[PDB]
Amino acid sequence: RGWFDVLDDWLKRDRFVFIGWSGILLFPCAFLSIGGWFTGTTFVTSWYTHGLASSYLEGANFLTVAVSTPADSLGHSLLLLWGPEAQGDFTRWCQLGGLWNFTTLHGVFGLIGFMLRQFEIARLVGVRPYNAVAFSGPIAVYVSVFLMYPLGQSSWFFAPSWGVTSIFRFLLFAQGFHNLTLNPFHMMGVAGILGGALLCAIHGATVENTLFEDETYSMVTANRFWSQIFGIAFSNKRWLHFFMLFVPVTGLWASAIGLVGIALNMRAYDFVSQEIRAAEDPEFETFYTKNILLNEGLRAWMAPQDQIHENFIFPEEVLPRGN
C-alpha cells in the first residue's frame, strides 16, 4: 500500500464533511473567493476605477457594497498580484480592482471543484450523477456572464461587479444597451425558470394533498385530478421527476447562449420592418417603438456616469426627453 492508496483512503474516510479529491480544488478556491468578496466589500474601495464609494469604510450600506470591476484601461489583463500592473504592491493591486479578478477566478475553480465533487460523491454512493448534469447549468451561466461577456467586450470593466446594486446596474445596463428582454434566448431562459418554480410548487402541493392515510401518495388520484382539472397529467413518476430536472436546466442553457450572443453585440436589438415603417410615417406607434425610446433615454442618461472613463459630455440639449 503506497502513499497514494493511504492518501486516497484518508480522503474518502467518513467525517462531518466529505473531502474527496475534489476538495483539494474546491475548498481552497471557494474559501479564497468568499474571502476576496468579504475583503473587497469591507475595506477596498472603487474610488479610482468607477469613482464610487463601495465599501464599509466609505460608509456604504449592505445593499451598496460591491467588489467593483477593474478599470477600463487595463483591457482584459489578468491582474496578477505580481503582474506588470500590480508589480507586487498589494495596495495598488487592490486599488486597480484586482480583487474582482481574484474573486471571479477562484469562483470559477470553486464551481469546477463542486461539479467534480458531485461526480465523486455519486461515484461513491453508486447512483446516476444526474446532480452533476443539473449543476452544469449554473456553471454555464457563470462562465457566460462573468467570463465570456467581459471578454467579448472592451474590458473587465463591463462585467457584473460583485454586489447587489451593482448587479442591478448590470441588469439595467444590459436592457439599455443590448435590449436583452427582446432576445429570444432570454425568453426561453425566463420560461425555464418560471416553469421550474411552477413545477416545484404544484408538485409539492399535489404530493401533500394526495397523501395516503398512514411511494407514499396516490399517483392514481393525482393523475385523475390533474387530467380532469387541467387536461393533461403525468402518468409516469420517472418522467415527472426527470422533467422537473430538465426544465430549469434547459432554461439556464438557453439564457447562456443568449448571453454569449450579446457578448459580441450579436444582439436582437430591433425589428427591421418596424423601424422602416416608423420611418415612413410618424403616427405609427407601438409598444416596441416606445421600448426603443426608453432604451435611448437610459443609454443617454446612464453613459456619462456609468462609463466615467470615456469622459462623455452630453449637454442638456442632446438628452432625449418626452418634450
Binding site: 429570444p184 425568453m187 426561453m188 436582437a268 425589428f271 427591421v272 420592418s273
Partner: peptide
C-alpha cells in the same frame, strides 16, 4: 412561434 418573429426580422 417564438422564433418566427425574428426569422421574418
Amino acid at each position: 412561434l417564438l422564433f418566427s418573429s425574428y426569422f421574418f426580422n
